[PDB]
Amino acid sequence: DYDYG
Amino acid sequence: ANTNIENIGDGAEVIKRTEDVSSKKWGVTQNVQFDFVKDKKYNKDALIVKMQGFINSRTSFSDVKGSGYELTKRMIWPFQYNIGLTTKDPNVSLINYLPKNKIETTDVGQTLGYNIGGNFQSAPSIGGNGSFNYSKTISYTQKSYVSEVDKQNSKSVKWGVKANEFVTPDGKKSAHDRYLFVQSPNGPTGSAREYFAPDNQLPPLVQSGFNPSFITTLSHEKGSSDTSEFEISYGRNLDITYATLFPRTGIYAERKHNAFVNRNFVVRYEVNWKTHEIKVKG
């Protein structure tokens, strides 16, 4: 989630 | 030499090896087949490598943190899947690859044939003839995407399965349309997901991932050094689509193309031409 979730 | 051996005619056989290597970090499974062609009437060794498995789309929908971005949502999605095989050893070269040319059809089905005496032939189809001593096929689906040979030379091959044209409520949209997959959310209580096209509008390569099916044959002079290393890379290039809901002008979209490039899982293999074996290195 690329540290976005 | 060992285990799965197919006699393909007089003085010739194929020795079949496999490897399965996955990465939960990269969201990839490499399911690779490595078939040695052992023909007394061919002065080279040959290894037909068929690359299958899975590359996760890594699609996601998220909120954007910070002041001024409260109604801005982010969709990350794969603009291209990357499949490649590379070597650096002087003792090995690539002598064929499939697909060899750009292919834009939803289904891709091709065959590599071998005939005794070192004779390879490729066909952009499946089920052509019973004239080959040995054959290997590739089969994959790429709805809304096209397959291109990004690089090919004696030491490396790289394919790109790239977003092309999509079916949308408003008709066909190019992969380069900034409003591709963007929709107005139904309710200000609209989660990040609601700013983007529902799953039933996203083709498999966007929603789930891709199941590669590619071939390249490695060639090695008989008598040269026993082993060669090579790397197989599977991955994706991701784009970002940002969608902002403005108070009076509505939905606004911006695309970051090539947002995350070369998010690839690379595995190094060693072929031992003398023992007809494959090992995963590292």
Numbering used by the authors:
A (entry chain M): 25 to 29
B (entry chain A): 28 to 309
What does the paper say about this structure?
Staphylococcus aureus (SA) leukocidin ED (LukED) belongs to a family of bicomponent pore forming toxins that play important roles in SA immune evasion and nutrient acquisition. LukED targets specific G protein-coupled chemokine receptors to lyse human erythrocytes (red blood cells) and leukocytes (white blood cells). Each leukotoxin is made up of two subunits of approximately 30 kDa: a host cell targeting S-component (HlgA, HlgC, LukE, lukS-PV, and LukA/G), and a polymerization F- component (HlgB, LukD, lukF-PV, and LukB/H), which can bind the plasma membrane through highly conserved phosphocholine binding sites. Each toxin is composed of two domains: a central β sandwich called the CAP domain and involved in inter-protomer interactions, and a RIM domain which contains several divergent loops driving host cell specificity.
Although CCR2 is normally an in vivo target of HlgA rather than LukE, Tam and coworkers have shown that cells expressing WT CCR5 or a CCR5 chimera harbouring the CCR2 N-terminal region display the same susceptibility to LukED intoxication. We found that sTyr26 and sTyr28 of CCR2 respectively bind to site 1 and site 2 through the same interactions observed in the pCS and ACKR1 peptide-bound structures. Two alternate conformations were clearly visible for sTyr26, differing by a rotation of approximately 90° of the phenyl ring. However, residual electron density was still present after model building and suggested the existence of a third alternate conformation of sTyr26, with its sulfate group interacting at site 2. This third alternate conformation clashes with the sulfate group of sTyr28, suggesting the existence of a minor population of molecules in which sTyr28 unbinds while sTyr26 flips its sidechain to the second site. Our work demonstrates that site 1 is used to bind ACKR1 sTyr 41, CCR2 sTyr 26, and CCR5 sTyr 10, while site 2 can accommodate an additional downstream sulfotyrosine such as CCR5 sTyr 14 or 15, or CCR2 sTyr 28. Site 2 is only conserved in LukE and HlgA, and likely confers to these toxins the ability to bind the second sTyr of the motif in the N-termini of CCR2, CCR5, and CXCR2.
